[PDB]
């Protein structure tokens, strides 16, 4: 039954973290942890960190057997954007979106 | 057993105990209406065709209830000519049940 | 003047006007006015008569829907608004002269 971990406010774009999330969605925790620890993407540290938090929650707060757990569902949401100014040529300015994301992971049998 | 009858300017092929829809008839709840102008009555292998009507053939029907038609939206619009028009229409209808068919 | 005339006529016609010989409250005290209204069967009323005494004013003002006005200073919005009207014969005569 579904134990949740949330990692609101990651300093990374949701569009980048979604590629990591798609590969661990639905897998067992062991396979997902392996993928995340041998992944070459920055989103993977955040996803592994939230998955580990979820596993710890399911093992401590609810007393579940992590041997039979799975990544029941995972999705990434856009967080708050920090708005910055980028100077360009000829005295013109551009806005810069330093995007963040919220990572939600739910594990269950 | 089936028959071809007229009602509301339209023609209907009907069988016994069929629930039919026709244009609003000024006839009270539950009354019996008899039509002797049926165009054809078919009893199976026997076929009778009126010229233009079949003598001695009558069909009895009853009005279960009167209901308004489903709302229909009507939109007229002339592009660039500053003209739009909107209307809603419901068509009155009466249910008819055929108790029996006589040839 | 004609609007006032019609308002008074329709008040009489629908029995919302009540003539009294006099209405003098002995002392400034709401309960006495309430007792008088109890016998007159007019919980809510507008009282208009020759002159307004301080004691009757002090008794009337506190009451939710009871108000007292002099005959000269009378308004149609008040006459229409308040459900019942208490009015003296002398005030009525002066309304006749005014209108």
């Amino acid at each position: 039954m579904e134990v949740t971990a949330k990692l609101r406010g990651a300093a990374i774009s949701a569009q980048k973290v979604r590629l990591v999330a798609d590969e661990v969605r639905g897998k067992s925790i062991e396979r997902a942890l392996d993928i995340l620890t041998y992944s070459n993407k920055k989103g993977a540290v955040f996803v592994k960190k939230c998955l580990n938090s979820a596993i710890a929650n399911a093992e401590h707060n609810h007393g579940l057997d992590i041997d039979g757990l799975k990544v029941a569902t995972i999705y990434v949401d856009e967080g708050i954007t920090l708005k910055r100014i980028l100077p360009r040529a000829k005295g013109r300015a551009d806005r810069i979106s330093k995007r963040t994301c919220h990572i939600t992971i739910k594990v269950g049998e | 057993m089936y028959a071809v009858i007229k009602t509301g300017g339209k023609q209907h092929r009907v069988v016994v105990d069929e629930l039919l829809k026709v244009e609003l008839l000024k006839a009270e709840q539950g009354e019996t209406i008899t039509f002797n102008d049926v165009l054809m009555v078919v009893d199976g292998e026997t076929v009778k065709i009126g010229q233009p009507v079949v003598d001695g053939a009558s069909v009895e029907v009853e009005v279960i209830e009167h209901g308004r038609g489903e709302k229909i939206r009507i939109v007229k619009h002339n592009r660039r000519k500053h003209y739009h028009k909107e209307q809603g229409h419901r068509q009155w209808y009466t249910l008819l049940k055929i108790k029996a068919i006589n040839a | 003047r004609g609007a006032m005339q019609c308002i008074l006529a329709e008040l009489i016609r629908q029995e919302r006007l009540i003539l009294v010989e006099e209405l003098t409250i002995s002392a400034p005290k709401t309960k006495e006015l309430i007792a008088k209204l109890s016998e007159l069967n007019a919980p809510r009323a507008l009282i208009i008569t020759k002159e307004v005494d301080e004691n009757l004013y002090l008794a009337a003002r506190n009451i939710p829907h009871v108000n007292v006005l002099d005959t000269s200073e009378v308004d149609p919005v008040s006459l229409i608004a308040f459900d019942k009207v208490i009015m003296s014969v002398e005030a009525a005569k002066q309304f006749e002269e005014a209108l």
């Binding site: - | 092929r13 076929v47 007229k76 619009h77 | -």
Partner: protein
Amino acid sequence: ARVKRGVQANRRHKKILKRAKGYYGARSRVYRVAVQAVTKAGQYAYRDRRNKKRTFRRLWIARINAGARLNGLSYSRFINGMKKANITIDRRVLADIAMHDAATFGALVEKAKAEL
């Protein structure tokens, strides 16, 4: 006496977006595109309410032609034979009979051919 337009504007726009349910892209999501699609949809409905009677008469005529040619006669002669026989059966009923009852349509064609 200021009037704020928020609530009424919201309900006005929701009506259009509700009528625009099922449309593609901006047409079912954003009002500027949805409102045109709803008006154009009403125009199409208004025109096809005229056109549907023609289409169904077309279909009835095709089926009656097929039945008459199965029974050895063409549509333009079968209808003429109906009219000479004083048979008032409409094309909708004639097509229904041709499609679902072959023998009765054969009898009708026999009457028409006897009248011709």
